[PDB]
């Protein structure tokens, strides 16, 4: 299991300045096919994470070259030259080279003080412990079966965690063992909808759950599942 170490956790900055975030993997994330699936995400409060950099240095369509990714093997860096108000939020690195995919702890980029494709997730769920829940992710604007569908958990407890994914076309799955088979990913071709079933829920399962496709290029608004006795 690869551990992603982000540095620093807090990064105060003045507008126009240059920010530099580091990420280190417990072990090489060079995939056998030659690629290094290192990604950088930016999450603004109340929103879903947004893809900025993939494969170490590719800028996602729409991201300004103010954002620059570099690195190799186990060392990676994200540099933001001339920071803008829009850049403020929490940055996360992610490795998608080895299952289970993992995220860094995050970097809070805050200001120094003084002086059409879319994924629609179902409504929030409130369930009792030991119960089971099923949330959906309706896809549109692209060919649902041409891309794997990922599910990500977010809780203040351990930030972002990759649950697993599914190939909507053939049903092939990939799970994060930490969930111990309690999670089941399914799909419905007719309606281009992905589903996630989580059973034997405890308070620890209370979080925001996201579905994400096209290698993190598109996310749902998330679904809040609250487990209370």
């Amino acid at each position: 299991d690869i551990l992603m170490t982000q540095t620093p956790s807090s990064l105060p900055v003045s507008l126009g300045d240059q920010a530099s975030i580091s990420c280190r993997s417990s072990q090489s994330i060079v995939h056998s096919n030659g690629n290094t699936y290192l990604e950088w995400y930016l999450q603004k409060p109340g929103q879903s994470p947004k893809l900025l950099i993939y494969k170490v240095s590719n800028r996602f369509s729409g991201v300004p070259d103010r954002f620059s990714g570099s690195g190799s093997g186990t060392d990676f860096t994200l540099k933001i030259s001339r920071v803008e108000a829009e850049d403020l939020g929490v940055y996360y690195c992610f490795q998608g080279s080895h299952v289970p995919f993992t995220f860094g702890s995050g970097t809070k980029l805050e200001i120094k003080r003084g002086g059409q494709v879319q994924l629609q997730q179902s409504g929030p769920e409130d369930v009792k412990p030991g119960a089971s829940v099923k949330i959906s992710c309706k896809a549109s604007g692209y060919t649902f079966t041409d891309y794997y569908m990922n599910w990500v958990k977010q809780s203040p407890g351990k930030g972002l965690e990759w649950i697993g994914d599914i190939n909507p076309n053939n049903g092939g799955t990939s799970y994060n063992q930490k969930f111990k088979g309690r999670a089941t990913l399914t799909v419905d071709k007719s309606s281009s909808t992905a589903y996630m079933e989580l059973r034997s829920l405890t308070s620890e399962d209370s979080s925001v759950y996201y579905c994400e496709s096209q290698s993190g290029a598109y996310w749902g608004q998330g679904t809040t599942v609250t487990v209370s006795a």
Partner: peptide, 4 residues
């Protein structure tokens, strides 16, 4: 072999 599986990747994101």
């Amino acid at each position: 072999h599986h990747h994101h």
